[PDB]
Amino acid sequence: KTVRWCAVSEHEATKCQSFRDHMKSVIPSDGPSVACVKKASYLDCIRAIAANEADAVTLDAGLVYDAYLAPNNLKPVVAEFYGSKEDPQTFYYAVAVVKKDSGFQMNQLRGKKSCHTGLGRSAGWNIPIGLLYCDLPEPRKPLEKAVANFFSGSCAPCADGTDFPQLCQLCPGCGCSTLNQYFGYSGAFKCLKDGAGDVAFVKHSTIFENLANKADRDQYELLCLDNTRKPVDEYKDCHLAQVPSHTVVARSMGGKEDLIWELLNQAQEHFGKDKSKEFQLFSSPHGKDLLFKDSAHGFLKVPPRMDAKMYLGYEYVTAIRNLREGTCPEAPTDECKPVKWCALSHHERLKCDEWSVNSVGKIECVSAETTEDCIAKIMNGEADAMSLDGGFVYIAGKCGLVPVLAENYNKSDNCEDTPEAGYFAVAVVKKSASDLTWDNLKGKKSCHTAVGRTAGWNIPMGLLYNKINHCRFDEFFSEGCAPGSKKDSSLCKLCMGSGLNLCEPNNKEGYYGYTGAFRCLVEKGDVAFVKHQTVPQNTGGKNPDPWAKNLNEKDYELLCLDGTRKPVEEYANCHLARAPNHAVVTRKDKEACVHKILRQQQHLFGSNVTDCSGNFCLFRSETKDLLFRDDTVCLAKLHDRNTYEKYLGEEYVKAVGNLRKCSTSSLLEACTFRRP
């Protein structure tokens, strides 16, 4: 029950020691205890934890990467935060600050004047230069020389000014102290404010630290990696990298990550911020930043689905990966590199493989275990693209993937030029029971297509979540028919299926499906959740079944959100959510390529090819809905609707977000950690 903490100095070792003693006093026998292993450096502590000689050490971002690499394979487990519990700020954001008075993008930096905090600083040098590496002219070695040849002039504090003079065209001499006015965070900023340089590579917070008034800050903007600009306020959507400030790492396997938390949590309570002046966890009597940044205001537990590559982020790992590997391509900078599609079944992999060979090597294939695994691969660049249902388009979005192409199902002449935006989830109720409004559904009897279905379960219950009486979903409706629920619950009490099929999600239920939940509506039921065209396709004599023959539209109204009621064909204005189509998701940086390659690919192997036995076609599966839903006719370009929030209804988002409170996703919880 003891955690072996690793110190990298003598001063640190001492702090660890009194950290042991002070935690020895307050904590009872059945409490965590601290041990103090002492090594020579951060690298040694890393190898020690790997060799199972120590348990935990707290690293900067650069070392977090080093730690995860073979043969160490360490992972982040506990993080320092630097604000309050509502504003944690466990991360910082390397930004590129510019005048609003200028007009140029990230990809137009070549030939501009730059301002760096200092050579070797992550935010002010490593990150930017790492991202810009391939855009620098050959030779890239040495780096200082290359960066000199990229910017017309620079202030790079702590550069070989005598060898690379241009790196100090803005601050002559390359002063690496506060005597150079263009040095550090405040200095790199003043380098911009004074109009000496065109761009300042700094932290998101730098601008707030140097300009108090929102008036002056508005004279500045941010360079986003997609070659757009945004106000200084929205760094969260316009940064060069998101960097974990200080992180605790342990073994990826057998790390005792729970003990570290159990310890560190009970430490920050007894000796956290403004706690005991007997011993400060975030203050050193013997130096500064011993074991932990004195900045820190506490700890947070890192969700367990988090690997190091996920925690640092694509951009961060790319920056340092370039600096180390230094391997740029040589292929025409115009032509799209192949798109790595992610498969999650054997049959998915097979179909993908065939696609790849006919794609003349323009499509590639990557296997992953689950959907959540495939999404992770997209995130960190192991894969490029995949098609997701609304539920996953949401999770991918929370992780910062973007919808680019919608699966079109309706035969449209120019469907390539029009997204669908899906059908409409409606709550239908007869005009008979006439005092029914959205509000007084509490304790009413209901009729769902099936539990886990979008229009039938997800959307309605998702929105009813605010008043759902806890994750107990059977408590809301006195009784109902939710095919798939446990065969003993209140939501199986209306399902008229004889024998084994009494509450089973299949045809033999009779009160299952869109058409079924509607029979459930009439045959013992108050309310039913279906699609917008379920009423018109079952009434008017469209359905010749015993119960359905003689039903008419005029009888059934649709329930609205605002509490009002409306006719059926007024669904457009009286709907719950806009149950969406499946959509191809990808990284923002590969948005351009996915669009083209997939447009060309659906031309060759699209819905427009017959003789699918002698020629490959993309929208036919061997089994069922491999890679894409087989109902797809084309892939619609998502102009405008190319964020998760903008592709899914604001209501769909609210609903799915609510349901995800009862059914956790380890990926989602990890992604929401980086983006709260």
Residues in the site for Au ion, rule: CB under 5 A? 22, 25-26, 60, 204-205, 270, 278, 595, 603, 606, 639
Interatomic CA distance for residues 484 and 498, integer angstroms: 15
Nearer to Au ion (CB atom), residue 60 or residue 570: 60
246 annotated as belonging to a binding site for a ligand:
yes
The nearer residue to Au ion, 229 or 270, going by C-beta atoms, is: 270
Q: Is 11 annotated as a binding residue?
A: no
Distance CA 515, CA 538 (A): 7
65 is in an annotated binding site: no
Annotated binding residue at 347? Answer: no
Q: Which residue's entry shows tokens 């309570």? A: 269
Report the run of H or E that residue 439 belongs to, with start and end. none
Which tokens belong to 600? 């060309």
Pairing of strands 91-99, 241-244: antiparallel
CB-wise, 627 or 636, nearer to Au ion?
Answer: 636
**174 vs 627, beta carbon nearer Au ion:** 627
Give least dist CB 67 to Au ion, A. 13
Closest distance to Au ion from the beta carbon of 202 (Å): 11
H helix or E strand, kind and range, residue 244:
strand 241-244
**Does 135 show up as a binding residue in the annotation?**
no
The dihedral over CA atoms of 528, 475, 561, 636, expressed in degrees to the nearest 10, equals: -70
Type of residue at 40: A
Residue nearest Au ion, Cβ-based: 22
- Residue 311 annotated in ligand binding: no
Alpha-carbon span 151 to 141, nearest angstrom: 16
Closest distance between Au ion and the C-beta of residue 421, in Å?
16
In whole angstroms, the minimum distance from the beta carbon of 487 to Au ion comes to: 24
Nearer to Au ion, 60 or 651 (CB): 60
Structure tokens at 301: 């537990």
What is the CB neighbour count within 10 angstroms for residue 468? 18
Least distance to Au ion from the beta carbon of 496, Å? Answer: 32
Q: Between residues 41 and 573, which has the closer beta carbon with respect to Au ion?
A: 41
Is residue 549 a contact partner of residue 541, using CB atoms and an 8 Å limit?
yes
Beta strands in 423-473 (DSSP E): 425-430, 446-447
| Paired sense of beta strands 74-81 and 480-481, if any | unpaired
The alpha carbon dihedral of 645, 648, 650, 651 has a sign of negative
Question: Are the beta carbons of 74 and 46 closer than 8 angstroms?
Answer: yes
- Crossing angle for the helix pair 666-674 and 390-398, to the nearest 10 degrees: 40
Any known ligand binding at 456?
yes
What is the residue-wise DSSP string for 376-418?
HHHHHTS--EEEE-HHHHHHHHHTT-EEEEEEE-S--TTGGG-
Closer Cβ to Au ion, 209 or 622, answer by number: 209
Output the smallest distance, CB 499 to Au ion, in A: 35
Residue 453, annotated ligand binder? yes
Pick between residue 204 and residue 531 the one whose CB is nearest to Au ion: 204
Taking the complex as a whole, how short is the minimal distance between the CB of residue 25 and Au ion, in angstroms?
A: 5
Comparing C-alpha atoms, which of 354, 398, 360, 378 is closest to residue 627?
354
User: Which residue from 355, 391, 384 is spatially nearest to 368, judged by alpha carbons?
Assistant: 384
List, in sequence order, every residue forming a beta bridge with 7; answer none if it has no partner: 38
Min separation Cβ 133 and Au ion, Å: 25
Mention every residue, 6+ apart, whose C-beta is less than 8 A from residue 274: none
Query: Which CB, 179 or 360, lies closer to Au ion?
Result: 360
Q: Which is nearer to Au ion, 270 or 444 (CB)?
A: 270
What single-letter amino acid sits at 483?
A: P
Say whether 144 sits in a helix, a strand or coil.
Answer: helix
The tokens for 524 are: 């013992």
CA distance 372 to 352: 18
State which residue, 189 or 514, has the beta carbon closest to Au ion.
189
Closer CB to Au ion, 243 or 343, in the complex: 243
Spatial neighbors of 264 by CB under 8 A, at least 6 apart, are 78, 248, 299
The residue count of the chain comes to 676
3-state secondary structure of 158: coil
Q: What DSSP element (H or E) covers 373?
A: helix 371-380
Side-chain half-sphere of 166: how many Cα atoms within 13 Å?
14
CB 19 within 8 A of CB 35: no
Asked if residue 449 belongs to a known ligand binding site, the reply is yes
Report residue 428 as tokens. 């239908």
How far apart (Å, rounded) are the C-alpha atoms in residues 43 and 353?
42
Is 117 annotated as belonging to a binding site? yes
Q: How many CA atoms lie within 13 A of 171 on its CB side?
A: 31
Minimum distance of Au ion from residue 548's CB (angstroms): 39
C-beta of 205 vs 621, nearer to Au ion:
205
- Of 57, 59, 61, 60, nearest in space to 45 by CA: 57
Rounded least distance, CB 606 to Au ion, Å: 5
Bond into 544 cis (ω within 30): no
110 is in an annotated binding site: no
Q: Which amino acid is at 498?
A: S
Q: Which is nearer to Au ion, 419 or 606 (CB)?
A: 606
* Residues that constitute the known binding site: 60, 92, 117, 121, 123-124, 185, 246, 389, 423, 449, 453, 455-456, 514, 582
* Residues that constitute the known binding site for Fe(3+): 60, 92, 185, 246, 389, 423, 514, 582
* Residues that constitute the known binding site for hydrogencarbonate: 117, 121, 123-124, 449, 453, 455-456
